Amino acid sequence: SEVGPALFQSDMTFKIFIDGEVNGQKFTIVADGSSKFPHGDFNVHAVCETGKLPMSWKPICHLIEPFFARYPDGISHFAQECFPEGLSIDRTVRFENDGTMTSHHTYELDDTCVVSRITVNCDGFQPDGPIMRDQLVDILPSETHMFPHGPNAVRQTATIGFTTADGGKMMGHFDSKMTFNGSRAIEIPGPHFVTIITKQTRDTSDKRDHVCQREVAYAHSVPRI
């Protein structure tokens, strides 16, 4: 039937609303992108409505689409299977020697546009560290570990990584859970890995604070790192 991956057989779009704060400084972001079939290599553009973003955009990368990873046959694409009802995410990213980002996401489908609403609290960030001083340069590739969790959720663990301006790295520990919002039975995956390659750049057009980002994301059974 017309559920789950059947709703991902065409080109699609996505839209993201983020309500956040960092060290008590409120910010608001909106973002829009597309994912062309067969998925796995998708782009987004994001803008801060509140003015200048008060922290690096790099740690926002994972807030601005698991359902647009490319999955092989043989591994359940849980995130796609969650549609049309959608899914919620609860996620904590803990930056080494720095602060912690805790987010709650909801995802719904409208026609071919997956819309997410996200709240995020970014607490304990170091004022002289490379997040608050905007010193993160590149986003490293990550191999995340996905595993089923209970009857209707999948968890993942990873380390997320950023290079810094003077040749160092900033790593965070990433824990996230996706929960199906419906009640019908959907296929839970076996444990597996997803390779995530991210490239974020500043958009220097005009005056406003905006970025472009691309993500290549693909699943596989055995780790490559």
Task: Provide the 8-state DSSP code for 28.
Answer: E
Element (H, E) at 113: strand 113-123
Nearest to 67 by CA among 108, 26, 99: 108
β-bridge mates for residue 8, sequence order: none
CB–CB of 62/81 below 8 Å? no
- Domain formed by 1-225, architecture: Beta Barrel (2.40)
Which structure tokens are listed for 79? 């995130």
The technique by which this structure was obtained is X-ray
Nearest to 221 by CA among 197, 196, 193: 193
Domain residues of the chain, as ranges? 1-225
User: How far is residue 95's CA from residue 131's CA, in Å, rounded to a whole number?
Assistant: 9
Nearest to 77 by CA among 67, 87, 86: 67
